[PDB]
């Protein structure tokens, strides 16, 4: 009748090195009142990419987020790309020159090393504090990151220069908040800024913080209170 | 009339270094208003099992803790020790195998190295994704911690393997909130997640963040702010 | 471009103890379990138990409990195993092999050189 | 504790035929088995998983089949690069046994 997806990185399920972990905490899944077959589980390999374009497969999904601070990512960049509903279009850095529109329409490119620099453009796409000739006197917004939300002076044309050969840049519009999903965070104390706005700060119930320990103790836990968090999502 | 005890960690009176500091600071209590003999000074020497039994001698305790990285223990895991009233009975992991029965029951163990492994039993006796005979097929769940409260899903049986040796294991149910005492954290901007469940964090005014700097300016602190620290007990 | 390089081998006097070693190269250490193999020359290949290093799980074969005893060093990217009270049948050849990951659990798909023991006093 | 049983214990052929090792296991390891190539001195390398799949490097002439308490590896146009001996693991949880070995002679 109801699915519940749980999303997990691959480090987890190494850690717990079972050939059946599924299948237990299936069973276990029955106690806590979901049918043989009501239960899923995907396996994210790479959270930046994942969290772009996560397909949600079920009815209810609760994606587990364990702070890695090798890895150079931002914990709130990931939870803004999950938590939300994006739609994202393709750039031609080369050809064109682009602005965002709104407080929604955002740069996220992501890749091997993001380095972004920009260079506004009056209105006659002419350089405003820059040659669009020569990019040295450009404006660098980004040194080689792993995920990057960038964000502009709105209603102004830019030329962008990215470095495409690792990094790959697309215009996104924000359109809302994703109720079928959560976020439970492992580890970090780390209180997440999901706002471009520096102004505000939103703390929902569709984001939780468990305390790492090991991987079996945080399934056991994500089972031991199921209901509890399929609560504050259809809540 | 009414008696407030401070609690403090050894480092904190060793760092002060005076045999009359708990007098000094006694006359100064009268600035606040309490007489001669209203105030008393206990010394924990180990936070832990503090945290666990403790023997609350004053109408009104506060608790100093000063966040330790070099000790591993989670403030969080000591919090939720403190403010709230346990009452646990011993476990023989040897004869006996154990189940959680509500949100309220879990498993504290502490120690010099706690290292816990578990095997879940259907209604047979029999393990499930484990062999109750060989330990190799259990699941870990605490790998030599010092304070662990370990949390299985809730009305299912477990042979349990702890390191005995070297760990204590106690099964206690959470009856509910103590009044009489305070948290006074210094150090760490960490944020307490003092819940079990995921879903939940309550952050409640007997639970207060001081800013590090020397134990005597700690102490003249509290003396400075008593009633307000006493204020937000009665509260 | 994954690589395990164990220590050189080394020859003990019955009733000491040895300290083996595998270096890891070419992938995250924290992130994959440590297998040890034991091959004597006419009994093929024994398990001896595992190791996660960083997380610190552990599993031992019940038949070398006693014997061995697995560490790991991740500032090192070193895996260790100690051999207890050494015996003439303790000679042979041990191994270090990476355990995949997720998808396939326990395929050991990377092996050390091997590394030589031989008791004799 | 799973019992590997490898057969035969020794082989014997020229290049280009067709030789079949066999592994039979005492209880049923689903499909969770695996074969390793050891090369006269050197260490073992995994040749095929999951009963069935092979690694990337691994040529094809490498057949791995079978389910339950029957598997077997099949290599079939053996070149002179193929000699040496031949394991057989499970991988269905510890402990892990492994095969007693198969050695792969060149026949004369």
């Known amino acids: 009748t109801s699915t519940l997806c749980l999303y997990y990185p691959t480090e987890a399920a190494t850690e717990i090195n079972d050939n059946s972990w599924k299948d237990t905490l299936s069973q276990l899944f029955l106690t806590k009142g979901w049918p043989t077959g009501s239960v899923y589980f995907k396996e994210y390999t790479d959270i930046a990419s994942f969290s772009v374009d996560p397909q949600l497969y079920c009815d209810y999904n609760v994606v587990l987020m364990k702070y890695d601070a090798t890895l150079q990512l931002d914990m709130s960049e990931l939870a803004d790309l999950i938590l939300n509903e994006w739609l994202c279009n393709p750039m031609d850095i080369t050809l064109y020159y682009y602005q965002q529109t709104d407080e929604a329409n955002k740069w996220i490119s992501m890749g091997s090393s993001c380095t972004i620099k920009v260079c506004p453009l009056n209105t006659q796409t002419l350089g405003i504090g820059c040659l669009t000739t020569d990019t040295a006197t450009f404006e660098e917004v980004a040194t080689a990151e792993k995920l990057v939300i960038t964000d502009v002076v709105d209603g102004v044309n830019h030329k962008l220069d990215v470095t495409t050969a690792t990094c790959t840049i697309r215009n996104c519009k924000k359109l809302g908040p994703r109720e079928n999903v959560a976020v439970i965070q492992v580890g970090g104390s780390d209180v997440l800024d999901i706002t471009a706005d520096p102004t505000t700060a939103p703390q929902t119930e569709r984001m939780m913080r468990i305390n790492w320990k090991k991987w079996w103790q945080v399934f056991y836990t994500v089972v031991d209170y199921v209901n509890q968090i399929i609560q504050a999502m259809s809540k | 009339t009414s008696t407030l005890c401070l609690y403090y960690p050894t480092e904190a009176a060793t760092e002060i270094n005076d045999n009359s500091w708990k007098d000094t600071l006694s006359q100064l209590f009268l600035t606040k208003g309490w007489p001669t003999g209203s105030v008393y000074f206990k010394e924990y020497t180990d936070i832990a099992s503090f945290s666990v039994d403790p023997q609350l001698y004053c109408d009104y305790n506060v608790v100093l803790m000063k966040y330790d990285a070099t000790l591993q223990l989670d403030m969080s895991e000591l919090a939720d020790l403190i403010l709230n009233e346990w009452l646990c009975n011993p476990m023989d992991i040897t004869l006996y195998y154990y189940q959680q029965t509500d949100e309220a029951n879990k498993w504290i163990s502490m120690g010099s190295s706690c290292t816990i492994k578990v095997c879940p039993l259907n209604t047979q006796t029999l393990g499930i994704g484990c062999l109750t005979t060989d330990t190799a097929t259990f699941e870990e769940v605490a790998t030599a911690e010092k304070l662990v409260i370990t949390d299985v899903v809730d009305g299912v049986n477990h042979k349990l393997d702890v390191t005995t040796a070297t760990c204590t294991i106690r099964n206690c149910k959470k009856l509910g909130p103590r009044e009489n005492v305070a948290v006074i954290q210094v150090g760490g901007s960490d944020v307490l997640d003092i819940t079990a469940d995921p879903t939940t964090a309550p952050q409640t005014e007997r639970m207060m963040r001081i800013n590090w700097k020397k134990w005597w300016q700690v102490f003249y602190t509290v003396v400075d702010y008593v009633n307000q620290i006493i204020q937000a007990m009665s509260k | 471009q994954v690589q395990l390089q164990q220590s050189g081998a080394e020859l003990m006097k019955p009733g000491a103890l040895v300290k083996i070693s595998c270096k890891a190269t070419?992938?995250?250490?924290?992130?994959?379990?440590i297998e040890w193999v034991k091959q004597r020359p006419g009994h093929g290949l024994e398990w001896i138990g595992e190791i996660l290093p960083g997380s610190g799980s552990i599993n031992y074969n019940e038949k070398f409990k006693g014997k061995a005893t697995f560490t790991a060093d991740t500032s090192s990217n070193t895996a260790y195993m100690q051999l207890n009270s050494l015996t003439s049948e303790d000679s042979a050849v041990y191994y270090c092999?990476?355990?995949?990951?997720?998808?396939?659990?326990?395929?050991?798909?990377?092996w050390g050189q091997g590394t030589s023991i031989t008791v004799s006093s | 504790d799973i019992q590997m049983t490898q057969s035969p214990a020794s082989l014997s052929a020229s290049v280009g035929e067709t030789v079949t090792i066999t592994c039979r296991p005492s209880?049923?390891?689903?499909?969770?088995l695996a074969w390793y190539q050891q090369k006269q001195g050197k260490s073992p390398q995994l040749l095929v998983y999951?009963?069935?799949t092979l690694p990337e490097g691994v040529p094809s002439r490498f057949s791995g089949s079978g389910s339950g308490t029957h598997f077997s590896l099949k290599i079939s146009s053996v070149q002179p690069e193929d000699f040496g001996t031949y394991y057989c693991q499970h991988h269905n949880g510890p402990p892990l046994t492994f095969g007693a070995g198969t050695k792969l002679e060149l026949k004369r």
């Open positions: 999951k009963a069935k």
């Open positions: 070419g992938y995250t250490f924290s992130s994959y379990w």
């Open positions: 092999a990476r355990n995949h990951g997720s998808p396939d659990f326990h395929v050991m798909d990377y």
């Open positions: 209880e049923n390891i689903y499909s969770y």
